[PDB]
């Protein structure tokens, strides 16, 4: 895994805890200060940045696992949505989702729509409208050689 | 016998290392029933446009008819800041600065990514590839399967088997397609000897002399009988397995011209084994399986893709060191070592006079360099 | 059975004489065998028969 | 575990492998050529000198043992003194053989030596019999001039090669009087030769150059090695200008 | 069981019973004359001798093995002092090789000496005579 | 009937077996401070093997016997020196010193 991102995710997660509620206005206020979308352009665009954004999306969705608190769930969801929506590079790297992980998001979306959080459900509606998921049996690929 | 034991909800056997076997064919229906998945056309449009969003959302999910949710759009699109990663307290900024520092240390230009350009081009081959005709377009929800192989041994001897290729194939295609698409330089090798007459043209490569090729997937040996010359290599594997009580249950045999990838009840990540041309072996790994997307190639016949052709070092001529070799000598009269390599111009002058008379006693064979397919 | 496949295997073990196929000497005399009447090694029999 | 799923401590073998290996289809399992090491040079030198000294001593040692047996069997004193003198001569022979400098007992390149013995005993089956035979015949031998050229033999080399027709380099190397193997002077001849390169590019060759690109080119990188393999005469250095 | 190529033993370790018996007899005779049969149990000396013989018949694929590996392969309980007897016999063989000009030039060691056991046994008489001209007693 | 309580075992090939003819009675080794406390126990009690064995839970009677015999055969001068000096019979302080030696060896094993 990219070591530099394991710290950036935890650093930006502090501002996620700083949010008072889950309403998407907090993210619009955050964007003005923590412009996480800086490296999205960088000085060079190649497989380097491709693998960079791939691993970033992967390890960020990794923080969407059940044990994380609801606020962290909303934070990770919105972060991944913004990241995917800001991918101006040639390829459109879609987030990789495991089949097992397709159970938590179900009750998550149910609780979000039942709470009348229109923005919370509209964000996922737009994500689905973009077809931004890589349906895979496992979240990552691994080999036994090492 | 029907599909062997397997659940289409893959549960790990060893966490994150392997998964239980499952009927991959059901994935094409399971995930497409759990989600409609419609929209595999890239029909994204290039006012009335917002009226469609209203007439959709106001009845699907949102109850309010007011277009207040467009805050998301105006924030994401309009408020997007040709930028340098500086003037902010982020750790990704730090790692990007470290990467840029290491680049400015030695790296002079960005054109050192040919190894990455390989995968880049092999993936671009899958985007923007329109079909030949309407009757050739892939159907919605088509299952796609990826696969890796490890043929050679030329790589590090004192190291693991990392450097080789990965492939990609469609589920609806027949297994004969995957069989004939797999490329291995072993099939280009030629039998016999050539020292008697180097001008002899290759009469028949091993691709035709030995067409037998079979797969091994959970005790299911799929043979091929398209041509009358091939043979049943599975006759020895069943005999040697049933001769002694080795614990390996009975294996079921079948043909390849009537079996599809859907009925492959196999594990992902497990190092399966595929063999062809007698004993040539290839450790295979099914890494990932997913349905068709609106960004994949639309040509179904053109999709035994070799998505990652791993680099290979072609053997240079041992004499001149400026050309690729084609002949390996044996029992040479002057070669410092028996496995010497020679090219056309060097092989002739080595042991052949002006009119082509064989000089001295030696053996030689046509060395088809693996670079032929690379 | 196809003609080419038959013609392919027969050339491995049979050698042509006067338009007729004759089995190779080494096939009838494996290297571990000898003459049943004199005991000379099969290599000698291979040369003599050929 | 890399080779085969069946790789038990004792792995089996199929019948088709016999047919595959009988028709000379050696493709990959025999191209694992490796370089040498200093310890390997020392081991080869020790093994060859020991083989020669053993072949020299064995008859003398056997004759000394036979003389001991005879003097232990015979009883006459005159014959005893005769055999004692014979064993003293043999003793001095063994002594001057053991005290022989290690340059004369090296023989020549093609000297009679048991290569299988040195390969299986000394090298412990690390190097094949021929792999050490050739290495001692051409690569490792004091009769091989290790000094480099003086840019004064290539002219005579190519003159004799043109007078003979480039048929047998061995005779050319022997007549040139360089005291080096043919493969040692040919590497420099073909390095100084000019026929290796090509000249101004024609129009028909552009067709092949574009075909070899449309057929196996990859993105911004062009594998010019494939062109060098297919297109003769063109090296790797200046062949990139054909596409730059 | 090393004489037959049973399924439990790789074919590489198999050897001829007559040649192995002869080699072990020569080895134990060298031991007998060098005071390696007095006081010490015979079984360990015989095991060390037969192990050295089995090794010397094919040092290529057997020198890497050890006495314990050989005993396990042969399915025979190895005598405890077999290691000491093997070490003493290897030391005796080394001392003998020092007299042979070519072997003394080889500068062999406890491990690489096993392969040259043939030449040592061929001229064991003069070699042991010279070695005793420079006896054997407990360390 | 037993329900899988024992595991099969191969034992003796019924073939030529090694003639051990030896029973190596396991004897616990002797530590330096342990030997010192044993010497002072001798000096305090004398040559009564029963009392020494009683006050030595870490050792056995035969072990003390062999140790005393070896010290006599090897270090008889130290035996006589210890027998010359005397010290008030100590059964309680002897147990305290035994616990101290136990703690010392536990520390030495921790290191």
Annotate F6-62 with DSSP letters as a single string. Answer: S-------SS----------------HHHHHHHHHHHHHH-S-HHHHHHT-TTS-HH
Residues of B within 8 A of C4 (CB-CB) are 229
Please state, in angstroms and as integers, the Cα–Cα distance from residue B90 to each residue in A50, B13, E104, following that order: 20, 39, 71
Q: How many whole angstroms separate alpha carbon A43 and alpha carbon A49?
A: 10
Q: What Rg do the C-alpha atoms of chain F give, in angstroms?
A: 21
How near does any CA of chain B get to the CA of D53, in Å?
Answer: 26
Is B312 within 8 Å of chain D by CB? no
- E15: DSSP letter: -
Number of H helices, E strands in chain D: 10, 0
Q: Closest chain C residue to B208 measured between Cα atoms?
A: C5
E77 and F19: CB-CB below 8 Å? no
Give the strand pairing for A133-136 and A95-98. Answer: parallel
Contact A143, B269 (CB under 8 A): yes
Round the CA-based radius of gyration of chain B to a whole number and report it.
28
Cβ contacts of B193 on chain D, cutoff 8 Å? 24
- In angstroms, rounded to a whole number, what is the distance separating the alpha carbons of residues D3 and B161? 10
E5/D contact by beta carbon, under 8 A: no
Tell me the nearest-neighbour CA distance from B27 into chain A, angstroms. Answer: 9
Pairing mode, strands B289-291 and B143-150: antiparallel
- What is the rounded (10 degree) CA torsion for A115, A120, A125, A131? -140
Q: Distance between CA atoms of B248 and B245, rounded to whole angstroms? A: 8
Q: Residue B190: CB partners within 8 Å, gap ≥ 6? A: B202, B204, B205, B206, B365, B366, B368
CB contact (8 A) between residue B92 and residue A122? no
Signed CA dihedral, B280, B286, B291, B297: sign only: negative
CA distances from D172 to B261, B359, C34 (A): 64, 15, 49
Q: Chain B window 195-224: which residues touch C at a Cβ cutoff of 8 Å?
A: 209
Instruction: Name every chain D residue with its beta carbon within 8 A of the beta carbon of E96.
Output: none
Handedness of CA B62, B65, B71, B76 (dihedral sign): positive
**CA dihedral (F30, F35, F41, F43) positive or negative:** positive
**Which of A4, A136, A145 lies closest to B161 in CB terms?**
A145
Residues 6+ apart with CB under 8 A from B187: B205, B206, B207, B276, B277
Give the chain E residue whose CA is nearest to the CA of F21.
Answer: E41
Burial B147-183 (b: 16+ CB within 10 A, else e): bbbbbbeeeeeeeebeebbbbbbbbbbebbbbbeebb
Q: Which residues of D touch E59 (CB under 8 A)?
A: 120-121, 124
Which of B14, B96, B166, B286 is the mutation pick for testing A, counting most A CBs within 10 A?
Answer: B96
d(CA B275, CA B212): 9
Chains in touch with C (3+ beta-carbon pairs under 8 Å) read: B
Angstrom CA distances, B65 to A129, B42, B57, B59, B71, stand at 20, 28, 9, 9, 15
CA atoms in the 13 A half-sphere facing the CB of B209: 20
Q: Which residue of E has its CA nearest to F10?
A: E75
Please report, for residues A105, B107, B235, B305, the alpha-carbon distance to residue A25 in angstroms, rounded to integers and kept in the order given. 22, 43, 69, 45
In the complex, which subunits touch D with 3 or more CB pairs below 8 angstroms? Answer: B, E
Q: Which two tokens stand for residue D152?
A: 């004064």
* A96 bridge partner residues: A134
Q: Which chains neighbour F (Cβ–Cβ under 8 Å, 3 or more pairs)?
A: E
Min Cα distance B51 → chain D (Å) is 44
CB contact residues (below 8 A), chain E span 103-132, against chain D: 103, 105-106, 115-116, 119, 123, 125-126
Strand, helix or coil at B273? strand
Using a 10 angstrom Cβ sphere, with 0-12 exposed, 13-18 middle and 19 or more buried, the burial of residue D244 is exposed
Residues sharing a CB contact under 8 Å with residue B374, sequence separation 6 or more, in sequence order: B309, B310, B311, B312, B314, D223
**Cα-Cα-Cα-Cα dihedral sign, residues B261, B264, B270, B274:** negative
Chain B contact for D221 (CB, 8 A cutoff): yes
* Count of CA atoms in the C-beta half-sphere (13 A) of B264: 27
Q: Report the SS3 class of residue B183.
A: coil
SS3 B19: strand
Q: Please state, as a whole number, how many other Cβ atoms lie within 10 Å of the Cβ of residue E53.
A: 23
Torsional class of F49: left (φ above 0), alpha (ψ -120 to 50), beta (otherwise): alpha
CA-wise closest residue to E11 among B138, D11, B307: D11
Query: Tokens in use for D239?
Result: 């062949």
> Which residues 146-175 of chain B have a CB within 8 Å of chain C?
none
Instruction: With beta carbons less than 8 A apart as the criterion, state whether D66 and E125 touch.
Output: no
- E18 vs C29: CA distance, rounded Å: 29
Best B288, B289, B291, B308 member to test A by mutation, with max A CBs in 10 Å, is B288
- On chain B, the residues whose CB falls within 8 A of the CB of C8 are 209, 229
Please say whether the beta carbons of E66 and E97 come within 8 A: no
Quote the CA–CA distance of D65 and E126 in Å, as a whole number. 8
C-alpha closest to that of A102 among A69, A70, A138: A138
- Tell me the C-alpha distance between A19 and A27, whole Å: 8
Q: How many other C-beta atoms are found inside a 10 Å radius of the C-beta of residue E23? A: 23
Q: How far, in Å, CA of B317 to CA of B120, rounded?
A: 31
Residue B336 CA, chain-centre distance (Å), reads 39
Chains C and E contact (Cβ–Cβ under 8 Å for 3 or more pairs):
no
Q: Which of E41, E73, E60, E68 has the alpha carbon at shortest distance from E114?
A: E60
Kindly report the nearest CA distance between residue D23 and chain E, in angstroms.
25
- Is D187:D173 a contact under the CB 8 Å cutoff? no
Give the experimental resolution in Å: 3.9
Tell me which residue in A118, A137, A140 faces B19 most closely, judged by beta carbons.
Answer: A137
Closest CA to B205 of B369, B374, B366: B366
Q: Which secondary-structure segment (H or E) carries B6?
A: none
**Residue B150 to residue B162: CA distance in whole angstroms:** 8
Q: Which residues contact A31 (CB under 8 A, 6 or more apart)?
A: A37, A82, B75, B79
**Do D44 and D136 touch, CB atoms closer than 8 A?**
yes
What's the CA gap between B247 and B241, in Å, rounded?
9
SS3 E27: helix
- In chain E, residues with a C-beta closer than 8 Å to the C-beta of D125 are 60-61
Please give the structure tokens belonging to residue A65: 């696992």
Chain C residues inside the 8 Å CB shell of B209:
8
Phi, psi of B148 (to 5 degrees): -130, 155
Distance from CA of B373 to the nearest CA of A (A): 24
What are the start-end ranges of the E strands in chain B?
Answer: 12-14, 18-19, 22-23, 143-150, 166-170, 213-217, 220-223, 252-255, 265-266, 271-276, 280-285, 289-291, 327-330, 341-342, 363-366
**What is the rounded CA–CA span in Å between residue B370 and residue B313?**
8
Residue labelled with tokens 């069981």: E1
Distance from CA of E138 to the nearest CA of D (A): 31
Q: State whether residue B176 is helix, strand or coil.
A: helix
Other Cβ atoms less than 10 A from the Cβ of E86: the count is 20
In this complex, which of B80, B100, B287 lies closest to A141 when CB atoms are compared?
Answer: B287
Contact D50 E59 (CB under 8 A): no
Question: What does DSSP assign to residue B8?
Answer: S
């Amino acid at each position: 895994t990219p070591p530099g991102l394991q710290t950036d995710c935890e650093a930006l997660l502090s501002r996620f805890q700083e949010t008072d509620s889950v309403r998407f206005e907090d993210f619009t206020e955050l964007w003005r200060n923590m412009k996480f979308g800086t490296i999205f352009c960088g000085r060079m665009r190649n497989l380097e940045k491709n693998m960079f954004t791939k691993e970033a999306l992967a390890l960020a969705w990794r923080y969407f696992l059940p044990p994380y608190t609801f606020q962290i769930r909303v934070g990770a969801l919105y972060l991944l949505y913004g990241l995917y929506n800001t991918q101006l590079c040639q390829p459109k790297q879609k987030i990789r989702v495991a089949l097992k992980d397709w159970d938590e998001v179900l009750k998550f979306q149910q609780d979000l729509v039942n709470a009348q959080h229109f923005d919370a459900a509209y964000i996922f509606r737009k994500l689905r409208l973009d077809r931004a998921f890589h349906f895979t049996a496992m979240p990552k690929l691994l080999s036994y050689r090492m | 016998v029907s599909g062997s034991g397997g659940c289409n909800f893959p549960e790990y056997e060893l966490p994150e290392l392997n998964t239980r076997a499952f009927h991959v064919g059901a994935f094409g229906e399971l995930w497409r029933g759990r989600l409609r998945g419609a929209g595999d056309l890239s029909l994204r449009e290039p006012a009335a446009d917002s009226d469609r969003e209203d007439a959709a959302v106001a009845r699907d999910l949102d109850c309010s008819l007011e277009a207040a949710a467009e805050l998301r759009a105006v924030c994401g699109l309009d408020k997007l800041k040709e930028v340098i990663p500086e003037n902010t307290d982020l750790v990704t900024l730090g790692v990007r600065k470290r990467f840029l520092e290491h680049r400015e240390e030695t790296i002079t230009i960005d054109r050192a990514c040919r190894q990455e350009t390989f995968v880049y081009e092999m993936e671009s081959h899958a985007i923007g590839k329109k079909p030949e005709n309407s009757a050739d377009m892939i159907e919605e929800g088509e299952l796609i399967l990826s696969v890796n192989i490890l043929y050679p041994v030329i790589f590090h001897k004192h190291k693991e088997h990392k450097p080789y290729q990965t492939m990609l194939v469609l589920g609806s295609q027949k297994l004969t397609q995957l069989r004939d698409s797999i490329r291995c330089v072993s099939d280009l090798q030629i039998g016999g000897e050539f020292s008697n007459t180097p001008d002899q043209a290759p009469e028949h490569i091993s691709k035709d002399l030995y067409k037998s090729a079979f797969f091994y997937f959970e005790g299911t040996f799929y043979n091929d009988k398209r041509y009358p010359e091939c043979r049943d290599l599975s006759r020895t594997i069943i005999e040697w397995s049933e001769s002694h009580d080795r614990g390996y249950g009975k294996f079921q045999t079948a043909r390849m011209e009537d079996f599809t990838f859907n009925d492959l009840c196999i594990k992902l990540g497990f190092p399966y084994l595929y063999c062809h041309q007698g004993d040539c072996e290839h450790v295979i790994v099914i890494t990932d399986i997913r349905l068709v997307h609106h960004d994949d190639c639309l040509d179904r016949t053109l999709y035994p893709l070799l998505i990652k052709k791993h680099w290979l070092w072609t053997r240079k001529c041992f004499v001149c060191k400026m050309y690729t070799a084609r002949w390996v000598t044996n029992n040479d009269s002057f070669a410092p070592e028996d496995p010497c390599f020679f090219c056309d111009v060097c092989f002739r002058m080595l042991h052949y006079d002006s009119e082509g008379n064989k000089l001295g006693e030696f053996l030689a064979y046509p060395y088809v360099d693996p670079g032929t397919f690379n | 059975i196809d003609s080419v496949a038959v013609l392919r295997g027969i050339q491995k073990v049979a050698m042509l004489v006067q338009g007729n196929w004759v089995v190779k000497s080494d096939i009838l005399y494996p290297k571990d065998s000898s003459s049943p009447h004199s005991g000379v090694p099969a290599e000698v029999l291979c040369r003599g028969r050929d | 575990y890399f080779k085969d799923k069946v790789t038990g401590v004792g792995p089996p073998a199929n019948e088709d492998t016999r047919e595959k290996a009988a028709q000379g289809i050696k493709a990959f399992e025999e191209l694992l050529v490796t370089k040498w090491k200093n310890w390997e040079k020392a081991l080869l030198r020790k093994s060859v000198v020991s083989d020669r000294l053993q072949r020299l001593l064995q008859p003398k040692l056997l004759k000394l043992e036979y003389l001991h047996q005879k003097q232990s069997k015979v009883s006459s004193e005159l014959e005893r003194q005769a055999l004692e003198k014979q064993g003293r001569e043999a003793e001095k022979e063994i002594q001057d053989i053991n005290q022989l400098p290690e340059e004369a007992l090296l023989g020549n390149r093609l000297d009679s030596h048991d290569w299988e013995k040195i390969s299986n005993i000394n090298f412990e089956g690390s190097r094949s019999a021929e792999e050490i035979r050739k290495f001692w015949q051409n690569s490792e031998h004091p009769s091989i001039n290790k000094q480099e050229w003086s840019r004064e033999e290539e002219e005579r080399l190519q003159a004799i090669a043109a007078a003979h027709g480039h048929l047998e380099w061995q005779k050319i190397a022997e007549e040139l009087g360089t005291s080096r193997s043919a493969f040692q002077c040919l590497q420099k001849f073909q390095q100084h030769n000019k026929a290796l390169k090509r000249k101004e590019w024609t129009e028909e060759e552009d067709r092949m150059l574009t075909q070899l690109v449309q057929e196996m080119r990859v993105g911004s990188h062009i594998p010019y090695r494939r062109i060098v393999y297919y297109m003769e005469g063109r090296d790797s250095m200046q062949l990139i200008y054909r596409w730059t | 069981k090393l004489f037959q190529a049973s399924p439990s033993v790789p074919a590489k370790y198999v050897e001829d019973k007559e040649k192995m018996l002869s080699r072990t007899m020569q080895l134990v005779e060298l031991a007998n004359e060098t005071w390696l049969v007095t006081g010490r149990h015979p079984l360990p000396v015989i095991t060390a001798a037969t192990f050295l013989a089995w090794q010397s018949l094919q040092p290529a694929d057997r020198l890497s093995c050890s006495l314990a590996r050989f005993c396990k392969l042969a399915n025979v309980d190895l005598p405890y002092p077999a290691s000491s007897r093997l070490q003493e016999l290897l030391a005796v063989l080394l001392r003998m090789a020092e007299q042979l000009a070519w072997l003394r030039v080889l500068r062999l060691d406890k491990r690489s000496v096993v392969k040259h056991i043939g030449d040592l046994l061929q001229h064991r008489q003069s070699l042991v005579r010279s070695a005793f001209r420079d006896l054997l007693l407990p360390p | 009937c037993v329900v899988e309580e024992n595991d099969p075992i191969f034992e003796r090939g019924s073939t030529t077996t090694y003639s051990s003819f030896r029973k190596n009675y396991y004897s616990k080794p002797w530590s330096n401070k342990e030997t010192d406390m044993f010497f002072l126990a001798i000096s305090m009690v004398g040559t009564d093997f029963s009392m020494i064995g009683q006050l030595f839970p870490h050792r056995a009677r035969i072990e003390i016997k062999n140790k005393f015999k070896r010290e006599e055969k090897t270090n008889g001068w130290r035996i006589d020196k210890a027998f010359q000096e005397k010290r008030p019979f100590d059964f309680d302080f002897f147990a305290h010193l035994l616990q101290k030696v136990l703690a010392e060896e536990e520390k030495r094993k921790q290191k």
